[PDB]
Amino acid sequence: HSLSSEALMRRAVSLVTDSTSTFLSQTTYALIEAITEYTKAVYTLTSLYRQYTSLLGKMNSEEEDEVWQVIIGARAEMTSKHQEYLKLETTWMTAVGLSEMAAEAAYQTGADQASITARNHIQLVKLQVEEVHQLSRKAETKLAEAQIEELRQKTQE
Amino acid sequence: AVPIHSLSSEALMRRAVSLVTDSTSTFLSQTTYALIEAITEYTKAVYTLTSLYRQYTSLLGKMNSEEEDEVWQVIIGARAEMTSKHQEYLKLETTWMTAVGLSEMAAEAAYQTGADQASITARNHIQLVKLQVEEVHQLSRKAETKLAEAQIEELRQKTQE
Amino acid sequence: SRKIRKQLVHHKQQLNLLKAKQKALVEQMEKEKIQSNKGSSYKLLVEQAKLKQATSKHFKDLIRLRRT
Amino acid sequence: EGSFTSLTGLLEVEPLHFTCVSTSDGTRIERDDGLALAISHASHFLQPPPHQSIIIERMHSGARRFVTLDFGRPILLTDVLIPTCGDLASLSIDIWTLGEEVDGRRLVVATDISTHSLILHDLIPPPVCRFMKITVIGRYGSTNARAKIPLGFYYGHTYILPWESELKNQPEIDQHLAMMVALQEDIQCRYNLACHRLETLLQSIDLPPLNSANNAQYFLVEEDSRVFSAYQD
Amino acid sequence: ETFTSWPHVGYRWAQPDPMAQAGFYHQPASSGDDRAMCFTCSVCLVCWEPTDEPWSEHERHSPNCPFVKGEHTQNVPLSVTLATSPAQFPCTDGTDRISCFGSGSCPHFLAAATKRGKICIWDVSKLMKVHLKFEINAYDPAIVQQLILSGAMEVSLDITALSILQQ
Amino acid sequence: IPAHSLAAFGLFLRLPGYAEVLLKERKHAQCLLRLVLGVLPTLPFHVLRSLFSTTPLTTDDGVLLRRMALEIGALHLILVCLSALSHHSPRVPRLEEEHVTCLLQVLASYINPVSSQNSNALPSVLLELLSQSCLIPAMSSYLRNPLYRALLELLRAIASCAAMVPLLLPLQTSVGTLLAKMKTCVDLVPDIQKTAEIVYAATTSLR
Ligand SMILES: [Zn+2]
């Protein structure tokens, strides 16, 4: 069974089309997870800002200082979440390019089935990532609205 | 005596990228093999055609029309074999280009995840396979140059007779 | 003969390199097993299966090369 | 710098050389970077060994390590000094002459290594020993990163006197005194010739009109290094 | 009691009793393993050494242990059980009266003989346990020849004094 | 720098005419003297080798120097130095390699100065003392294995003087036959062959 050279590529490229699809799956999941965690944190800070707004003028200086310090610590938590967010989105972009050009390699080998499977996986991860991007952006917009209401009531009082 | 779990996302990166910097390295050297295999068999066909041109050229003027026709058909068949194998070779090298880029930007991913060791291993492997591929390339061009010299000397003696 | 030898060495060089991948695969099965992150284990079992197919195909090539 | 008065009277106690005989798991010791023959050997006996240190491979909260050191002979120990090691919790030091459980006795269990160096000056009465036992324990929450732990310099009397012998094959005092006197005379000739060459070296310095501003300007040349070496000798 | 399968009984400090005193038990992942876990904090340790002091190892690997801190835990010392040990009957039935008892040059064991010939010797130095439980047979050939030298045969024996002798 | 060469140098400079050949190289002699007061280890024997070579047995100076060497015991010192360097005990009735080579060269120059009435020019006291030293077992052990050329020079030197020929006989494989087989195994070549033939001729003449 002296294998030709074409069957070696047709079998070989399936390795990377499954492996960069594995990287694309783990980056996509972890990015979705980090987005969801950051979205939950943003919703929590949004709730804190609304509660702080609703409590304005009903607390003394010490309680205002305590709630402000909690908000500052939550801001630092957002900064760390945003840093891991940017690194995760960077690695997911790198994985997207990895699986795209890997499936291109599968196309040029004639092993089109592994290529199309990788392709469908790229579109699936792109839609899932963009979906949870939209959810994160909605949470950020709600946080901005809560902050604007907080500033308006603080200035009003 | 000595001592004998919500994993963060960065460990998941180091794990996920370690899955790929090795398997792209796998398919990297598998491309390096298949490409070398074509560069070897096509070189075998080229050297076969070079030898055919050497015996045909040395025997020029000593054969009849039928013998010249059979030798020329063998030469044509060897030309078609080397041409078709070279056409496969071009697509093999076209694929090893992509495998190189796959391992390079996989090592970029590994550097992006903190798994520097997988990145350096992948890159050093890219340079190693690049050296091996360029070596067999230079062997292929050497045999092509030898074939070109044999064709020009065949044409020269054929013109002389 | 030299070429066939080269790919024999290459398959031996990659089969242990995927055996280590199986080891890391089992490690990651264990690590995400304790924390019930439901959607993780599905894609991790897909990871296990894909690497199993890569493992089996390399063994079949390991056999077929020695045939030649 | 005020605390530097902790070690006094260091002239009367000679430096002692060190030999590494035992170490522990994940721990190592490194060096930080015929009358004439007997005189040279005796002079080399009275020399300070270069700086050496312990490097630990694996540190944890409570990293327990054990080392043994030998001087090669029962020698009086009179002064100790452990340099500051801010990454360790505590140490203990025990010494013996013949056996760990034969004549081993505890000397110090010091838990103040991280903040200040260990100083214990003018050991009274001066014990004699040849083997030394060290037990150290790492600080809690220790970062697992390599660091140096210098041993410091240890001083005592290698040659023992009859009354120092009676606490716990000694050559007679007269011949030992004679050969150290010979070493003193030889070092006197060497000191005179070396200092004399230093004098000729400093006399080999061309002196322009005195502008000490230029003298300070010379700080910011091979001459400085050679005068430094000559002064060192 | 958990340290029955301890492979390091011959060690100096890794003896079953001092490391049980520190509040640890043998729970090895495999037979012959020296793995042990604490009954209060459950810190796990392996690859023990003959120089490993129980209190020192427990304090170093678990300074937060209430046992290490001296704080009141649920520990039950053996002395409490010893001072409240319910009297063990010399026989399983618990009906035969005790004719005699005592000890000799080896009082680590306590012997109690009944009127029916059943004698139980306890290991009263250690935890209360049955060490020897037996019955004296009066038809012993040594006893038979001793009685023959005194002058169907009927022989009855009653123990009036007990003593345990050792070198 | 081994101490034995420096210690032997102090005795070596006692011989008249030692300083005359010592002062040929001023820098190394000054450095050696500086090391004495408080390449270098080769010189204490290299100067002696030069002095032995320059002073032949055909003149009274060479034989007087050799008998003073016997009288003061320099040969016993060099033999025990060779014994310590080669880990070989006497027949009781990388620096080390270069040291052994220089010592063998000194011995060769002492026996035959020209190699670098001559039979009775060396007294048989040297013969009986050299019958007790470590030269024969050490040379035998080294035969079974720069230095090789020095050893061949030592062989032609030890065979040149008649009074010194009898120590070539083993106390039962002859040295000439052993040298012939190792020479054939090795086959620099012409010198080895010529010295082997000379040694064989000397052994046959003695026998
Ligand atoms: Zn505990």
UniProtKB/Swiss-Prot annotation, chain A:
Signal sequence, renumbered to the chain: none
Quote the protein name from its UniProt record: Diablo IAP-binding mitochondrial protein, cleaved form
Whole-protein coverage range: 66 to 222 of 239
What changing residue 16 to D does, per the record, is:
Monomeric. Impairs interaction with BIRC6. Impairs ability to inhibit BIRC6 caspase ubiquitination
UniProtKB/Swiss-Prot annotation, chain B:
- What does the UniProt record report as the effect of altering residue 20 to D in this chain? Monomeric. Impairs interaction with BIRC6. Impairs ability to inhibit BIRC6 caspase ubiquitination
Superkingdom field: Eukaryota
Known consequence of changing residue 65 to L?
In DFNA64; does not increase apoptotic activity compared to wild-type; enhances the degradation of mutant and wild-type protein via heterodimerization; cells expressing the mutant protein show increased susceptibility to calcium-induced loss of mitochondrial potential compared to wild-type, indicating increased sensitivity to mitochondrial stress and suggestive of mitochondrial dysfunction
Intervals of motif IAP-binding: 1-4
What's this protein's name? Diablo IAP-binding mitochondrial protein, cleaved form
Curated annotation (Swiss-Prot), chain E:
Q: Which residues bind Zn(2+)?
A: 38, 41, 58, 65
WD repeat windows: 89-136
State the disulfide connectivity: none
Subunit comment: Homodimer; antiparallel. Interacts with RNF41. Interacts with DIABLO/SMAC, likely with higher affinity to SMAC dimer than SMAC monomer; this interaction blocks the substrate-binding site and inhibits the caspase inhibition activity of BIRC6. Interacts with KIF23/MKLP1, USP8/UBPY, BIRC5/survivin, MAP2K1/MEK1, RAB8A/RAB8, RAB11A/RAB11, PLK1, EXOC3/SEC6 and EXOC4/SEC8.
Subcellular localization(s) per the UniProt record: Golgi apparatus, trans-Golgi network membrane; Endosome; Cytoplasm, Cytoskeleton, Spindle pole; Cytoplasm, Cytoskeleton, Microtubule organizing center, Centrosome
The segments carrying the BIR repeats are 1-87
Please tell me in which tissues this protein is expressed: Expressed in brain cancer cells.
PTM per Swiss-Prot/TrEMBL: Ubiquitinated; mediated by RNF41 E3 ligase and leads to proteasomal degradation, impairing inhibition of apoptosis. Deubiquitinated by USP8/UBPY. Autoubiquitinated; mediated by E1 ubiquitin activating enzyme UBA6.
Q: What is this protein called?
A: Dual E2 ubiquitin-conjugating enzyme/E3 ubiquitin-protein ligase BIRC6
Effect the entry attributes to changing residue 52 to A: Abolishes interaction with CASP3 and the caspase inhibition activity on CASP3. Impairs interaction with CASP7 and abolishes the caspase inhibition activity on CASP7. Abolishes interaction with CASP9
Q: What is known of its domains?
A: The BIR domain is essential for its anti-apoptotic function and is important for binding to DIABLO/SMAC and caspases.
Protein family per UniProt: Belongs to the BIRC6 family.
UniProtKB/Swiss-Prot annotation, chain F:
What does UniProt say on post-translational modification here? Ubiquitinated; mediated by RNF41 E3 ligase and leads to proteasomal degradation, impairing inhibition of apoptosis. Deubiquitinated by USP8/UBPY. Autoubiquitinated; mediated by E1 ubiquitin activating enzyme UBA6. Proteolytically cleaved. Acts as substrate for CASP3, CASP6, CASP7, CASP9 and HTRA2.
Location comes to: Golgi apparatus, trans-Golgi network membrane; Endosome; Cytoplasm, Cytoskeleton, Spindle pole; Cytoplasm, Cytoskeleton, Microtubule organizing center, Centrosome
Annotated tissue distribution: Expressed in brain cancer cells.
From which domain of life does this come? Eukaryota
Subunit info here reads: Homodimer; antiparallel. Interacts with RNF41. Interacts with DIABLO/SMAC, likely with higher affinity to SMAC dimer than SMAC monomer; this interaction blocks the substrate-binding site and inhibits the caspase inhibition activity of BIRC6. Interacts with KIF23/MKLP1, USP8/UBPY, BIRC5/survivin, MAP2K1/MEK1, RAB8A/RAB8, RAB11A/RAB11, PLK1, EXOC3/SEC6 and EXOC4/SEC8.
Task: Let me see what the UniProt entry remarks about domains.
Answer: The BIR domain is essential for its anti-apoptotic function and is important for binding to DIABLO/SMAC and caspases.
Family under the similarity heading: Belongs to the BIRC6 family.
Would you tell me the protein name for this molecule? Dual E2 ubiquitin-conjugating enzyme/E3 ubiquitin-protein ligase BIRC6
Q: What gene does this protein come from?
A: BIRC6
Range covered out of full length:
4153 to 4496 of 4857
